[PDB]
Amino acid sequence: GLLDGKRILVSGIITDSSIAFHIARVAQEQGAQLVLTGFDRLRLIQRITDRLPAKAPLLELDVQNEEHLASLAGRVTEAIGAGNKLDGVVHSIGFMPQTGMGINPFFDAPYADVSKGIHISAYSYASMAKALLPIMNPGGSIVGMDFDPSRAMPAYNWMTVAKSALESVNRFVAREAGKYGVRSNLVAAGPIRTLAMSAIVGGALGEEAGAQIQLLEEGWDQRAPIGWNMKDATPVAKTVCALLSDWLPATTGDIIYADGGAHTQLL
Amino acid sequence: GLLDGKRILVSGIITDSSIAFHIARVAQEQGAQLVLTGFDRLRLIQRITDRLPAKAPLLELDVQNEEHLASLAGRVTEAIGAGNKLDGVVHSIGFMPQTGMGINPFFDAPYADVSKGIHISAYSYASMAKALLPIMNPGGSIVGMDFDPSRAMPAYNWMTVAKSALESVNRFVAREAGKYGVRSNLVAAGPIRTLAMSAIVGGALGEEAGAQIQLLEEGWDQRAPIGWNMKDATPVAKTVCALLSDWLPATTGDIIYADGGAHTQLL
Amino acid sequence: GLLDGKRILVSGIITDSSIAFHIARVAQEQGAQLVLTGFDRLRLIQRITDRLPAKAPLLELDVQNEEHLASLAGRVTEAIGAGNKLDGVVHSIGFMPQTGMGINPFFDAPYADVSKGIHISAYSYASMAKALLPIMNPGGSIVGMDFDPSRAMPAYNWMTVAKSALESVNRFVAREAGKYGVRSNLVAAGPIRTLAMSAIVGGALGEEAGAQIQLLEEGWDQRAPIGWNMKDATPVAKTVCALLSDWLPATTGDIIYADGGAHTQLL
Amino acid sequence: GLLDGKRILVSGIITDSSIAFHIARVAQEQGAQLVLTGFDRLRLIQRITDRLPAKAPLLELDVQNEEHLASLAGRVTEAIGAGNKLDGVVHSIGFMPQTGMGINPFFDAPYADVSKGIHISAYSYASMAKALLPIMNPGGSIVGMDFDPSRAMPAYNWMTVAKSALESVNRFVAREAGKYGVRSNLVAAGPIRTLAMSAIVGGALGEEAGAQIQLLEEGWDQRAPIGWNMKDATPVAKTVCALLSDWLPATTGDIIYADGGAHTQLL
Ligand SMILES: NC(=O)C1=CN([C@@H]2O[C@H](COP(=O)(O)OP(=O)(O)OC[C@H]3O[C@@H](n4cnc5c(N)ncnc54)[C@H](O)[C@@H]3O)[C@@H](O)[C@H]2O)C=CC1
Ligand SMILES: NC(=O)C1=CN([C@@H]2O[C@H](COP(=O)(O)OP(=O)(O)OC[C@H]3O[C@@H](n4cnc5c(N)ncnc54)[C@H](O)[C@@H]3O)[C@@H](O)[C@H]2O)C=CC1
Ligand SMILES: NC(=O)C1=CN([C@@H]2O[C@H](COP(=O)(O)OP(=O)(O)OC[C@H]3O[C@@H](n4cnc5c(N)ncnc54)[C@H](O)[C@@H]3O)[C@@H](O)[C@H]2O)C=CC1
Ligand SMILES: NC(=O)C1=CN([C@@H]2O[C@H](COP(=O)(O)OP(=O)(O)OC[C@H]3O[C@@H](n4cnc5c(N)ncnc54)[C@H](O)[C@@H]3O)[C@@H](O)[C@H]2O)C=CC1
């Protein structure tokens, strides 16, 4: 097992097609003992996570709640047992109000909406790291989920801005995490058909947005020298596991592209 | 005159060592007619700008004020005369509460403070562009001021995060600005001794921050193959002018490094 | 005149649709006095350059010839007059044998052919700089022509490899050029319909290569927020002039994208 | 075993402090069956490789020899047995004549010397891939060794140019390798004290070169948020193994930084 005996917190499970669902699944298949956090529908998350190959305690964490964050390390050492520490943290959390993404014009997202999106999608990566670094082992590993924001793209709008901020946060958390013997890195995934992503191709955020996102995915798979299957999250899940393992021991403040090699190719 | 007959709005003058002061000065030396915006001490800004080689109307603009932004294009066409449009916009605005920069630990900046900094330093670049694109000529040019955030650095902390968000905003404003025949670009400047920067090397934000910033500047000048003079803002001012001119007509969504070539060199 | 009184060597004119032809034209329109170099058909180059707005001495330079390079600065100070120096050098030279570009498979280009291409397209940028730096003024400027090699693309093959090597050479020539007070930079141009580029879209190097190159150009213009006109080299010519001028005084070891902003956009 | 049952060719062992030595060692500790190639002193390489935890056939390969390359896949299937294929190729080969690296001035390396260096250090990555792709399994993995050439640095000179060319080659080999179901990637290592690197810090290539290289290493370890130990190649070896495994299944045409996170930090 790649992850044998490691104890690892995985956030971000909301449905069984959440990228964090598959990260959890692969991590357990690989020997890891998990603690899970979930945001707002804990009954639902409890029922989805019943499906994982092994039981895992589930704690509530709303990344905008000072109090949840303040108590987090206590609730975790409670769940894993006093004198035990975390080897791994997975941040797989993201959100942008719909005004920052539609065919809703880029200049019309108001700042309260984008600030909410950056709070949850970028800043929260530092918050998690602050709450959890005190309970991590030397040799530990924090991983977040990224979508390559280095060129602008249609429809993603402020969510791309949010990702740009995240990558920058990640280089700072790596500075802090290093004092603990801990790595911090991002996985830049190719587009994956979550519920939300399907809703958007189906037009939930405007028809032209849906059309641009559909073209985005097809181009991705054409460029990728090994192809990209948007319906299969397990290559991303394996990549997060690769970072949680002892096999990337000199990589930090960094970004690993789990995207079919698409970003390396112009067409 | 590089900028002959162009009409250009320059924001961000607060003292005579503001990078926007010198941008204004060089632009006027080069034939430009200016409109100036200023934030909170308009009496002071009025008195500093008296020093520019030519008179220029001064309008108040607090980039966090919906109302100032809503009225901005009216106040400007008023100042430049109905049926006249802007050829140029300079965004030279930046701020981060001191909790997001000290030896104040990176994980301790609260989100309200960083959100304030991102509002003013990143989001405001889109706001300015939204208010002003309706009154710009085809062939126009929007320029903002950047500090290369692509690697983390000591002390700059959340301000670097704010710059990462800005560069991403800039690639989106370029999408919008293109519909108007307008370029949008950033100038990534080397460190320049503003009042604030001096205050920090003098220790205003903690002694170790001051020491890291001093080391930052010295390394910069050593790497720069043509050297870097932190006391001279005029090479940056000329670069902003180069972008405001007709001489970079195919560059947009882009970043021009006015930094002595330092970012191209490891040591 | 942007370039008034500057003396500037422009290499690379072969026909009237050479990017160096237009660089020469715009530079002369802008006040520059030129010296021209040309490679193998000097009678032809003489006749094409008769068309420039002003006369210019023409010297022969085969960048693979040790002797031409050894004598170059002598022939130039002869043409510009003893005690006069160059303010500007334009390198607009490139070549790759057809085995390194066809539908000719990437793995089949033999090393002698690629070495020839790298010699002329990458190494020669250092050679020119070595021959000419002794006769350049402080404040001078060397500019080469680049095609963004940072992602692989169909058909360009080893020429992209050659461009990657060039950009790296450029960061080193900037180290040397700095000792003389001289900037060194690259202009990354969008695709431009030279004779050769037309020959390729017409299928000179295989039908699928021609088809991939045609798709390359169309994507370019779609992404570019201000569009890209492959038939108009004058926006690139103006950009080279912007670098030859005093208006980018703190940029070196660098790359300026004259590409419609296409590289900043994913789609 | 991370690499259980995989068959893997590792080139580049010359002494027991070769990065390929440790790659071989870790790969064998991890279940891999190896075939080894070696360049010019095969008796010596035979004796060094006796030290590996398991026996491995050793074949001669001079990457500049057309004939060695032409016969390579035959000699390998001979060594691994007909109907068996390679899962892994490690390219850990590099060389630049000393004229392209000293305090020997950058402009004085003659083209024959740099062409030799690029042949062996960059082009040879495509040659290996051409010889070996016919004998690789779907799901296979080719890995080369890189030193981040994205900024110029003292003393490395033309070897940095050679690395820039390599990274570009790698993005093309990924295009070819994809048709076979095969990944191609580079590991960008921090500086490691091979014999050669020690010789250089000891001044073999000039005193100021030695001094710049010493400063290079110290800066590296200061920037690296998790530090860098130049005497320990095993974190790099583990990284190459991470790429040879099934745990990075969606990464190709890419670069993984095994460098302590140093490239993500300015100071
Ligand atoms: N789906 C795609 O094509 C790609 C997604 N990503 C990133 O993957 C990560 C996971 O998203 P997906 O699995 O795709 O969608 P998802 O919707 O399954 O996951 C998003 C998670 O964020 C959690 N969340 C939202 N607000 C929260 C808050 N205040 N506190 C705590 N948690 C909160 C949600 O409960 C949900 O579990 C996100 O960062 C996303 O940006 C990266 C690349 C591609
Ligand atoms: N000084 C340095 O070493 C470098 C500075 N920069 C950037 O240059 C730009 C200008 O800053 P400097 O001239 O260095 O300092 P400065 O303090 O002279 O300029 C900052 C300007 O931001 C304006 N501002 C702050 N909040 C505002 C608000 N709510 N509305 C409108 N304006 C507001 C201030 O009034 C001031 O005029 C900033 O974006 C800065 O980040 C970029 C590279 C280097
Ligand atoms: N055409 C395009 O779409 C783009 C071209 N570029 C670059 O622009 C530069 C100029 O090429 P173009 O004007 O497009 O084509 P061109 O064919 O007009 O110019 C190429 C020049 O290289 C010169 N040359 C070849 N071998 C030489 C040698 N041994 N010594 C001296 N000169 C030699 C040729 O005589 C010719 O004048 C090249 O570096 C090219 O790679 C950059 C971006 C786009
Ligand atoms: N040592 C360092 O600080 C770093 C080295 N690298 C790269 O690691 C790779 C391995 O080099 P090291 O282990 O450091 O040194 P090394 O000297 O142990 O390995 C170099 C290998 O290249 C082989 N070689 C040279 N010419 C050859 C030819 N014609 N045919 C076949 N093989 C040939 C040599 O026999 C030797 O085994 C090289 O690509 C190097 O550039 C990357 C980052 C850092």
Residue numbers in the entry:
A (entry chain A), B (entry chain A), C (entry chain A), D (entry chain A): 3 to 269
Any passages from the paper?
InhA (also known as FabI) is an essential component of the type II fatty acid synthase system (FasII) involved in fatty acid elongation and is required for mycolate production in M. tuberculosis. The FasII system is highly conserved in bacteria but absent from humans making it an attractive drug target. InhA is already the target of the current frontline anti-tuberculosis agent isoniazid. The combined results unambiguously indicate that pyridomycin is a competitive inhibitor of the NADH-binding site of InhA, NADH-dependent enoyl-[Acyl-Carrier-Protein] reductase, the target of the two anti-tuberculosis pro-drugs isoniazid and ethionamide.
